[PDB]
Amino acid sequence: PSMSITRLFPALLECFGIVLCGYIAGRANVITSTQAKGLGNFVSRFALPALLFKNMVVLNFSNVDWSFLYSILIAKASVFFIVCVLTLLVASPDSRFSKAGLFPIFATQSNDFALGYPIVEALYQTTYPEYLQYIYLVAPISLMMLNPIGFIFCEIQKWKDTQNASQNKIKIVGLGLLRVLQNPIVFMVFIGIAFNFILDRKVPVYVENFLDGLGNSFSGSALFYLGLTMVGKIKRLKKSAFVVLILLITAKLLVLPLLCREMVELLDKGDSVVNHTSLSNYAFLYGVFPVAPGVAIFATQFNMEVEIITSGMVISTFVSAPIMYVSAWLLTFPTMDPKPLAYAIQNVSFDISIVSLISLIWSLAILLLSKKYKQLPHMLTTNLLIAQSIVCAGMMIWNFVKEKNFVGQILVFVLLYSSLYSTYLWTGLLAISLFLLKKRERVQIPVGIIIISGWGIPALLVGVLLITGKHNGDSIDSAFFYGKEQMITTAVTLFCSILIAGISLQSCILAQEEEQYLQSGDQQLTRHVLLCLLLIIGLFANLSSCLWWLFNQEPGRLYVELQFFCAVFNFGQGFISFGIFGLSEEIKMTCQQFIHYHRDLCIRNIVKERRTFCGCDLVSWLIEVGLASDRGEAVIYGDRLVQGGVIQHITNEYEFRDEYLFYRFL
Amino acid sequence: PSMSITRLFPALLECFGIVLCGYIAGRANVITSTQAKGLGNFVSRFALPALLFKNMVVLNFSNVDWSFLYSILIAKASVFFIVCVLTLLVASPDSRFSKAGLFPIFATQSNDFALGYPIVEALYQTTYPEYLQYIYLVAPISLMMLNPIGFIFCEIQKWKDTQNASQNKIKIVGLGLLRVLQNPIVFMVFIGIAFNFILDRKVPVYVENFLDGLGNSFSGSALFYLGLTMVGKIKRLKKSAFVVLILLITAKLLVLPLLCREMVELLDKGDSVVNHTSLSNYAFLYGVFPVAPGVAIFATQFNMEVEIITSGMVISTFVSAPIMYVSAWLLTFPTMDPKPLAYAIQNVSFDISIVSLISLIWSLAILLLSKKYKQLPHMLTTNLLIAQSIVCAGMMIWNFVKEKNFVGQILVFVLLYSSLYSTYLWTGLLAISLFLLKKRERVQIPVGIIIISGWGIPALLVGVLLITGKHNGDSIDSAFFYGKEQMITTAVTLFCSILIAGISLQSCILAQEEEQYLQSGDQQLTRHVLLCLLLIIGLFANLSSCLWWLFNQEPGRLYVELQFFCAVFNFGQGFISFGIFGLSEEIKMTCQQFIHYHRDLCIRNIVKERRTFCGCDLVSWLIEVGLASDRGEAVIYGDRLVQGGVIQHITNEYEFRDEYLFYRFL
Numbered sequence A, B: 001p002s003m004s005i006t007r008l009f010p011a012l013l014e015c016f017g018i019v020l021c022g023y024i025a026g027r028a029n030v031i032t033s034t035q036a037k038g039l040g041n042f043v044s045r046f047a048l049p050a051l052l053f054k055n056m057v058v059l060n061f062s063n064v065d066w067s068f069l070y071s072i073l074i075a076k077a078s079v080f081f082i083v084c085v086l087t088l089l090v091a092s093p094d095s096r097f098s099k100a101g102l103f104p105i106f107a108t109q110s111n112d113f114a115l116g117y118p119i120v121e122a123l124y125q126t127t128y129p130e131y132l133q134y135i136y137l138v139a140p141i142s143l144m145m146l147n148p149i150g151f152i153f154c155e156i157q158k159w160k161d162t163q164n165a166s167q168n169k170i171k172i173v174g175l176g177l178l179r180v181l182q183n184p185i186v187f188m189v190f191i192g193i194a195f196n197f198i199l200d201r202k203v204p205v206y207v208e209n210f211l212d213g214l215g216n217s218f219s220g221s222a223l224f225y226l227g228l229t230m231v232g233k234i235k236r237l238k239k240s241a242f243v244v245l246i247l248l249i250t251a252k253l254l255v256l257p258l259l260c261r262e263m264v265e266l267l268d269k270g271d272s273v274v275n276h277t278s279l280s281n282y283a284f285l286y287g288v289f290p291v292a293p294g295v296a297i298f299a300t301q302f303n304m305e306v307e308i309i310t311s312g313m314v315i316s317t318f319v320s321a322p323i324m325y326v327s328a329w330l331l332t333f334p335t336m337d338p339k340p341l342a343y344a345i346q347n348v349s350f351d352i353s354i355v356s357l358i359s360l361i362w363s364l365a366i367l368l369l370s371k372k373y374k375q376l377p378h379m380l381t382t383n384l385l386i387a388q389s390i391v392c393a394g395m396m397i398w399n400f401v402k403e404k405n406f407v408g409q410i411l412v413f414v415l416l417y418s419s420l421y422s423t424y425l426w427t428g429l430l431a432i433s434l435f436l437l438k439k440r441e442r443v444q445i446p447v448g449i450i451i452i453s454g455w456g457i458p459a460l461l462v463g464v465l466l467i468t469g470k471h472n473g474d475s476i477d478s479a480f481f482y483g484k485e486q487m488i489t490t491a492v493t494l495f496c497s498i499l500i501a502g503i504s505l506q507s508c509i510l511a512q513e514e515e516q517y518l519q520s521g522d523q524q525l526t527r528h529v530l531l532c533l534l535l536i537i538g539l540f541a542n543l544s545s546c547l548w549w550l551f552n553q554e555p556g557r558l559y560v561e562l563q564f565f566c567a568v569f570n571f572g573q574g575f576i577s578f579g580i581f582g583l584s585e586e587i588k589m590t591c592q593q594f595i596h597y598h599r600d601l602c603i604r605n606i607v608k609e610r611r612t613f614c615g616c617d618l619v620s621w622l623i624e625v626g627l628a629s630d631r632g633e634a635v636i637y638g639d640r641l642v643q644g645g646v647i648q649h650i651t652n653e654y655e656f657r658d659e660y661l662f663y664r665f666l
């Protein structure tokens, strides 16, 4: 009925595929950091103002439900107040106010013009068209209400830092209000209100096409720019910063949706209980939008807490999508029957499985063409991705052979759950390999023994399940294909894997040292330990669901959520693996420019005699001088120099890269 | 009926308003030339491929009329062959091939993805939707048939710089084909055809939203980027280059549409004569699309004929719009009745007049706030724009009061045509002032006498016309309000104006020197002659139409076109006048970056002792060193330096500008 949910997955695919395209373009150095400024300016100064003005001139303010806006504003104000009070009472006095100026803003301001609006449009287009108008009502008002307090706190921190006690509160409040008044959203909305009243809710035909043309290009360009602005933002941090970031993202993505739902339940007291449920669900879905990059822009402008804010915004952007999908499906579940419920679970798992299969075959092609799996622990990772691809393919076959052929059904079930148990066990084997590498022991690794164990133990478990179990062809879900025996063998396999994971966790000298450094750096322990920390979340979810079903024989109103979560993890675990292990005239001009003018003073610190400069030191020196903005521009400049015959590698085998590679002048 | 024409003006307004926004953003240094590369890459590598693939997957090749495509291709091939043959026969042997490789491409390839498609969509969405599919069929194929040959010619020019007569024809053809195969349009269309046949003309729902999101952001972004790429392109050229440019634009915008119409007349031999007429009228206005910037990109890549190609592309882009509008209206005219025809003329003139009044009041406000009209010849220009604004307002009043009141309509007519005669005379007075300034005589200019004459002679003419004329209130057009006497007065006024126009055409010394330079440069004599010529063109058109009506008393089937042209010029002459007249952590980082490392060697060539460097020399030196790409980067860098307390003006009154203003170090 309401909240058509089958249209949400393509909308999420749009929203995050454009972001992924932007990230890939930025990271492959197609677009550098300087060239992204043009796209950012076009999006912020011409497309968003046009979209806001066009949508705000026609709003019909006499037919707007203000209860929803009041509830959302009350929830946001409550979250802001709580975060500000806790930050003031907890943070150290040296940089207290700055935190209280930005942490509440981080946990309240969301990204709903670029990401939230397509989702809301897809969910509520033909069912509740009046909901799409609320976004343009809620996003600006919040900036009109909560941003000034944060800006005032930041100005107070700046005043303390400068120690200019002669200032008064009037100037601080004036600066705080002026910073929020100059935002294009605020005054564009004000002008939209003014022209809405002047023009009697009608857009002249002369400017309709112009406004539509500028407004239709906002969403995709903003998604691309958001993807571009995440190329190098996530960096290593400390434990305290990590805990603060986890708390902030939990406040943004968990506490706020629940508070919005509670406020909508309290304030709204209308008839048509169906509409009340729809409004509460809409509030919950609105609460889960990620943090807007405008907060990072504010932090950069104030030059305070920029790194933690940027990292948190980037992380929350990616964390929000599974939360959105699962929350929407869970809220749609109550208005369903058990057989359509199972069909919906099958369909969602099939969609996740097919997208994950495409991503996994792409990642496998990359890994095979890299030809780096011959040394540990890349081949175990290759086996893990192979098992994930096989389980995705097995489920896609199962969705069609569920009630088509018998022998095909048994064969598909065997393949699918052998692959599932293979992934479960391979998590533990990878953890064991990482722990063994941690011991730094120069002992041979039984690669053959571990691989045959990992690919034969699940086969033996499936065989004994077939021998001792009872077939049940009336079950739509493959989890209950046999029943008690399948459940107990899955539970014991998960328990063993989790226990294993927990227990486990002209210069020859220059050439030899650089190849030794390359060999040492090829062992990417960070990514492997990240994967062998992330998989146990889903392993724990699976084990908890199995134990809950075993202990609670009578099905309560919690096993459906566990089924959905475990299926989503089981058939989307390949996304994590893809995210980890898946990613002339001007030449002459720059050549003579470098040779003639500033060639001198270059060889003073970065070049020394060796029995002749690195790759990182030259990039750092170029950044220091001012010939580049980031590492990308330095890499492009070095490529320009090398292609022109200015410098060359010693071995004549590597191009200009930001590694520990040595080059010589010509 | 067919070809809904009342909604073409908003489409043109959108298409060129986004271009104007891009040009203003680029010229005001909001977006620098380096930062535009990101927008260009996003447009050319992600949005256009997505749009092309999405449109090519669903095309229904079994229901496509190939006669239109064949006729367009034949006309384009004929134009290409003619231009190539004439260029080969006429051009000097120094660069005979290079021009022959680029001139036929300039006159054939058009801009139909960004500009042509919105126009075709607006004109034909409701009446003939199938026409919308022809663009994506015509634009790619043309390249596949015409781009190689020309490219081969360019390769021959490169072969003329190698002095290797033996080798290699095969290599030349291979390079020519490889340059056209790597264009995203070509292989995107090929992949679209392949997936069209694979997918049975159906796109999966998973990628529908992604393709729609990337494809919907192409038109506005491409228009903005096109506007951005026209900031510093039009430059002074030679007479021969000007003649070649005029010939090339005439071939592109005049010969090609007529040839397309003729080929469609010859080949298409179908039924439903109305459909044949509509398809032949669609053949026309396809050849009036301006030159695509891809030709300029090709010229830059080949590094040959770059300046003439860029200037011609920009000029054709700006010239095509009135040609499109007038051609479409003239083609639509035959399917109308006399009274609806007159109403359509009134409506088109009213629309042009209202847009021109908005533009003119903007320009007048800018000129008044500039406070530079106190010296000749700016105040005469101010009077000219005042008269144009008054005539626009008078016509907008007339359209509402054409049949409302007697005294009101008489007063409105008097004001309107007094303003029209005022503009006609003020053209000649501006010509007289320019000629007097050319004589370089230090004689006082009777500004009061000339302004009194210019604002009084039209009043005397309209008064004597009212006294001796006869009222005719049954005419919708204001031209025949009185009859033959009004035509005689208009003709004699135009003849007098045309004759007049034709007949006429520390810091002791540095401060005064720069003041004298500013005074000399304030008299912008370069643009005034161009404005005079542009108004003379329309005055000549008006006089020709008046003489044609006077000599040809019986109305043939040519007076409607002259009426339309006269109305368009009379009520859009303000657009010409608007075009001529009307258009920190980083700080400290850059200031100590300049101070610490490369502060030295700056005072070696440009800075010298004076009784101390101009901004132009600093900009040129910064460009030469490599710290800036164009004048914009140098200007931004100088602003950063000045705001950081590095250099300051002698008078401390001028910010960092690319003028002859001396600056001193701190």
Ligand SMILES: CC(C)CCC[C@@H](C)[C@H]1CC[C@H]2[C@@H]3CC=C4C[C@@H](OC(=O)CCC(=O)O)CC[C@]4(C)[C@H]3CC[C@]12C
Residues within 6 Å of the ligand: A012, A013, A016, A017, A020, A023, A230, A231, A232, A233, A234, A235, A318, A321, A322, A325, A352, A572, A575, A578, A579
């Ligand atoms: C939730 C399901 C059912 C719907 C489909 C969601 C996917 C389209 C999302 C989910 C996880 C996303 C990924 C999560 C994390 C990343 C890493 C991200 O890069 C970084 O975070 C690196 C930053 C740096 O190096 O500074 C690039 C996008 C990517 C691959 C994302 C691409 C889009 C993905 C696959």
Ligand SMILES: CC(C)CCC[C@@H](C)[C@H]1CC[C@H]2[C@@H]3CC=C4C[C@@H](OC(=O)CCC(=O)O)CC[C@]4(C)[C@H]3CC[C@]12C
Residues within 6 Å of the ligand: B012, B013, B016, B017, B020, B023, B230, B231, B232, B233, B234, B235, B318, B321, B322, B325, B352, B572, B575, B578, B579
């Ligand atoms: C034809 C009518 C009925 C429809 C509306 C058309 C307008 C939207 C067009 C027609 C003429 C155009 C102008 C023609 C020329 C210019 C100059 C152009 O700048 C340059 O050419 C300078 C280039 C340089 O300095 O290098 C900026 C856009 C502008 C004002 C154009 C803006 C858009 C205009 C007013």
Ligand SMILES: CC(C)CCC[C@@H](C)[C@H]1CC[C@H]2[C@@H]3CC=C4C[C@@H](O)CC[C@]4(C)[C@H]3CC[C@]12C
Residues within 6 Å of the ligand: A234, A318, A319, A322, A352, A568, A569, A571, A572, A573, A575, A576, A578, A579, A580
């Ligand atoms: C359950 C399935 C369907 C979806 C899982 C989504 C979440 C849990 C996964 C999908 C891809 C993952 C990301 C993949 C790659 C990276 C880059 C790394 O440097 C930090 C972690 C990070 C950012 C991961 C965080 C967790 C992540 C966002």
Ligand SMILES: CC(C)CCC[C@@H](C)[C@H]1CC[C@H]2[C@@H]3CC=C4C[C@@H](O)CC[C@]4(C)[C@H]3CC[C@]12C
Residues within 6 Å of the ligand: B234, B318, B319, B322, B352, B534, B568, B569, B571, B572, B573, B575, B576, B578, B579, B580
């Ligand atoms: C008849 C009315 C309605 C429309 C007239 C359109 C044409 C003829 C006019 C409108 C604005 C004009 C432009 C205004 C400004 C400039 C900049 C100048 O450095 C070169 C000429 C150029 C580029 C003009 C060329 C002619 C132009 C394009």
